[PDB]
Design a binder for this molecule. Sequence first.
Ligand SMILES: CC[C@]1(O)C[C@@H]2CN(CCc3c([nH]c4ccccc34)[C@@](C(=O)OC)(c3cc4c(cc3OC)N(C=O)[C@H]3[C@@](O)(C(=O)OC)[C@H](OC(C)=O)[C@]5(CC)C=CCN6CC[C@]43[C@@H]65)C2)C1
Ligand SMILES: Nc1ncnc2c1ncn2[C@@H]1O[C@H](COP(=O)(O)OP(=O)(O)NP(=O)(O)O)[C@@H](O)[C@H]1O
Ligand SMILES: Nc1ncnc2c1ncn2[C@@H]1O[C@H](COP(=O)(O)OP(=O)(O)NP(=O)(O)O)[C@@H](O)[C@H]1O
Ligand SMILES: [Mg+2]
Ligand SMILES: [Mg+2]
Length: 1218
Amino acid sequence: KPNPLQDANLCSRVFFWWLNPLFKIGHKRRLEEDDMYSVLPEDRSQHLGEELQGFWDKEVLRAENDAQKPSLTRAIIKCYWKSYLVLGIFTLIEESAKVIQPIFLGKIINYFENYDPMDSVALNTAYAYATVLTFCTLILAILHHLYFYHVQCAGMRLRVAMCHMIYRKALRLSNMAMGKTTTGQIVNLLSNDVNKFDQVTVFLHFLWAGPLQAIAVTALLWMEIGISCLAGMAVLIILLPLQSCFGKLFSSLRSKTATFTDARIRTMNEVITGIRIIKMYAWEKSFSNLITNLRKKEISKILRSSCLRGMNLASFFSASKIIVFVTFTTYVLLGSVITASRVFVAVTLYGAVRLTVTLFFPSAIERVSEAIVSIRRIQTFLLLDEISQRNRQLPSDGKKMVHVQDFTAFWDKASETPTLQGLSFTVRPGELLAVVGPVGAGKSSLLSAVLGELAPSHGLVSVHGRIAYVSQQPWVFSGTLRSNILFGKKYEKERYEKVIKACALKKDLQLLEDGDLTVIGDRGTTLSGGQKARVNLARAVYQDADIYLLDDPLSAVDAEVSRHLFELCICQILHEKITILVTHQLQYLKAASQILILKDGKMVQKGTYTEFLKSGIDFGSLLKKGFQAYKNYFRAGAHWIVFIFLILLNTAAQVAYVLQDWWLSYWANKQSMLNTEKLDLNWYLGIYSGLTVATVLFGIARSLLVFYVLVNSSQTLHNKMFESILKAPVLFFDRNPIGRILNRFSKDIGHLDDLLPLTFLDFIQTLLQVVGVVSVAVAVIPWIAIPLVPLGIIFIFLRRYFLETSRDVKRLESTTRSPVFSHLSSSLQGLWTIRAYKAEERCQELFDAHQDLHSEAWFLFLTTSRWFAVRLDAICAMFVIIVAFGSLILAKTLDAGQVGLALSYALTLMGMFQWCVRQSAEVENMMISVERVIEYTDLEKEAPWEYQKRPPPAWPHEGVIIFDNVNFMYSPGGPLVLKHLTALIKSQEKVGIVGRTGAGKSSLISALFRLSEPEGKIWIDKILTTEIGLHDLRKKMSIIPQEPVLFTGTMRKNLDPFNEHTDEELWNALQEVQLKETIEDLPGKMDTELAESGSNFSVGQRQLVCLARAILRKNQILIIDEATANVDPRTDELIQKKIREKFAHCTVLTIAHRLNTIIDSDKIMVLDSGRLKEYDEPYVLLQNKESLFYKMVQQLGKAEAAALTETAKQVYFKRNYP
Ligand SMILES: CC[C@]1(O)C[C@@H]2CN(CCc3c([nH]c4ccccc34)[C@@](C(=O)OC)(c3cc4c(cc3OC)N(C=O)[C@H]3[C@@](O)(C(=O)OC)[C@H](OC(C)=O)[C@]5(CC)C=CCN6CC[C@]43[C@@H]65)C2)C1
Ligand SMILES: Nc1ncnc2c1ncn2[C@@H]1O[C@H](COP(=O)(O)OP(=O)(O)NP(=O)(O)O)[C@@H](O)[C@H]1O
Ligand SMILES: Nc1ncnc2c1ncn2[C@@H]1O[C@H](COP(=O)(O)OP(=O)(O)NP(=O)(O)O)[C@@H](O)[C@H]1O
Ligand SMILES: [Mg+2]
Ligand SMILES: [Mg+2]
């Protein structure tokens, strides 16, 4: 992938002419990673990393010699100052040109004031000054883009070198340092703490070019207009503390809103997760009240912050007008006169110095502070204690063996008991040494000590030869299964096939789409734990090391796979290699040549399996311990009359802004056309003050109205979205995951609430300023409207051409960034396995390649932006040149005031044009959140909660249920679940529910509750379920679900959200459920907040709370669904007994996976794939062996079957025959 930048000349590099093929390809089709240009040799990660590493080591050595702390900042400066001085020269030149050009503007105006049509020398001089002005504009418009690209390239180089150094350090962190730190911190100081270097270098050179430009501008202003410039300078200086105060208050007002936003998001997550339980209980009104209160509380603070930001923007808009008004008011009041060669030079100088003082200097200060903080963080990281490099090995005879003598060490030096107590043993090739012990013995500690991870406090360890080590937890890195097995070594087909066959990985390969080439992500999302363990063992065997160390290889695999592995990949293959193995299964101890028993870090016994059998101590014994989007977004805010008023306000503000400068020009012309007689100062100064006041007030009003309208639109959209969500049927929640649902409530609404209104206001402001500049230029010289049409057409086509490729470049850069973090995380998690072999330089090379693949896209991201900016600035410079030369060509018509006004506005169009284009692009990007919110606004809605026809309040009187021809489908067009169910449930009868694991037992409650609209007729106390609203039907039947859920709140809230009961009644219910004494010992009597689903409460406690809820509701129809699954027998018996005794006179339908709980039921439904087979007493079903009830009873066993039959017979005899 050759880089055309390596070929281009200086002329092509100035205009970025070498990116045209890339833009052509991007316009034609989509851009993939194969279309990117490889980085230049000087920008490769390894080169920069090694250069900065050498400089940093030299600085460290010097600092240690001098005996002070080292300075990463000093190292970086010593490395990059020579390359960062030339950019300083160029920014000096650029700032000098910026300061210079108003002088030539004033010279042109001065020529216009002393016009003489017959003179030609003055015309020639004016043309020369115009040429110099065009040269200055070209300098500011053309070369600045190459300068900016190099400025950003410096920061990119710094960041790449920093990342390389950080990874190189992290690859050799000691055990204690790794215990201090975490993987998250190391990933964070690459994802967030290294990106400050991209931004520090942009504004770094302004720390000396800001005050210098301010001083030069002040000197020029004093030379031009006199002492009156001090008032404008004072106002400009005062402008900074106002910004500081605004930013200080805005941060507090913003941080005061997260405490409501996070609570709202947490409640939303709870609602979305437990939507089925809420719908069954009909608590949507309570949750709606809670969410509404939280939203209002957050919206108040959002409104306050928006008002503050609008005031800040209005202050920026009116600052220049205020400065100029004050300056020229004191200038005129001191006794001078108004002239166009001075007014419109002071205006331009004030504008330039105001931009520089207000924005660039504070931005530079902030970026430098952040970069210093990040540098200090990385500097602290780079001095963590590192593992001492494996020193010169003791001279041996080349034999491969492992020996340990008198070893004693501890991970922590403050521990009372050492990790290992005087270990002393040796192992030779061909010996299968096994270590057997309980959890915590220290077998993995012994293996780590052999590897060298445990620093020997006392004793000696002699290990020679290559090492094969198997971690307790299998590890898979960012690659493929073939890559995992190869571990970077050269691929051999025969050896790979031999290892695959020996490891029985053929089934795992066949289970994958690509087989052995399938990509496995972080933590093996595409694989399983057994596959990871098999891959780890295969890699260890394939690497073909002299010494093999194993640690818990077969704990998490099946019996056949474990036996086949332990035999054919260890006993035969590794019979020529040194082997030390850690076991937990006793069946593999027979094949072990050596066995050691370890407990409490102390040696117990070592010998063969026969010797241990003769010892008499049992191992087992020892092992037991579009446009419509904009239209709807604007309509949701306010009426269209408000839109008309907003348009009028914007127009009035811009008109006053222009008219103040026009009035200055008119004053200058009227003073010039005079004669002593004097101008009436009262009139002119009064009109000036009125125009300034009107500009300020109109700007403030426009900003406030825009902000309020857009925030109201966001609030209305959120209300509509939540209202729609609360009524969507369960099918919608089944289709969409919880994360997707919560994303539109967390991120999209977050954008709409704070970012979009302010972005819109800024874009409108800048666009109106550009329109005003163009309108002034057209009004002064009408002929300028001719080339404006070609310029607009060219701009539109160029914008389309650029945007067809910029988005692809941005997505490529976004998708090429995560592999770096994934590789870092994988290498950090498998650091011991990486360091076991000598392959860490290969991991460094892989990381370098991953970093290069991202710098590949960053380069394009910078260059395409510069490519667009060059042409935009060319268009703007053409406009400026046209104005400046047409004014001189038509000198017989215009006058000084008009010429100066038009020329100054043409000069100020710069930067504003580019910012307007960028903000338009950003707004178009941001509208997708509004699109998604509006999409969720109009979801499908289920039946209304209430109907016109209301049943009597006493219904259900008895509780008789009729099922007639019930066909149930979860989704329309999906498979049928229930097939023509026909049954009658008499009042106050206990019915048990039986069938297979997919018989549809839990599908009956959905039909009864009408969660999904069923087909057929269901009659309850002679009312059909399809002619009454859902909230009037679900409220009269109680449900006890499989997994109880408790919502975060008070116990009174959890037991009675609608305050329909009394505290005494709730206490009586709690006493009935025997949880009252547990309730009344917390810090609060009944208002104790809980965690998610009551994480501090037991499962039995949650079931008991659900039973208490059912008791409190005290409805006639009770349904229980899979009550006891993994609860203790005591709580199971408690729940069964309480349910049996408390609801004697209430109809109960119970679905139980076990027949023990539902043996005493009066009747039993038999379900076969949604077909109702048998409905009668359980004794009758057990009488006939052909019944499915008898078959399932016999499936359980014999003794339990006999007990169940006896219990059913006893129940039948007691009930039917009293
Ligand atoms: C304090 C007074 C004043 O604001 C300073 C100062 C001047 N302003 C007047 C308008 C203005 C600004 N530049 C201009 C350049 C030419 C002509 C006019 C202007 C700007 C500003 O503030 O315009 C409101 C500004 C704004 C944003 C900006 C960068 C920027 O100047 C460099 N961004 C770059 O990406 C955006 C931002 O979102 C971002 O960086 O996002 C990752 C940014 O947020 C952060 C955290 O930086 C911000 C502004 C804080 C926040 C919300 C909305 N977005 C829209 C554009 C952007 C802005 C700077 C007045
Ligand atoms: N890397 C480590 N850092 C800190 N403590 C450790 C480390 N490795 C082991 N230990 C401690 O050393 C003691 C014994 O470890 P060890 O028994 O090898 O762990 P184990 O493998 O989970 N149990 P076992 O399988 O019987 O060896 C325990 O107190 C561990 O917490
Ligand atoms: N939301 C759903 N959408 C579509 N089919 C479903 C859904 N939930 C369950 N099913 C299937 O519909 C059939 C009805 O079985 P089901 O409702 O689970 O009763 P059950 O299995 O006997 N009781 P349980 O095992 O506790 O769920 C089964 O084949 C389920 O897999
Ligand atoms: Mg261990
Ligand atoms: Mg079910």
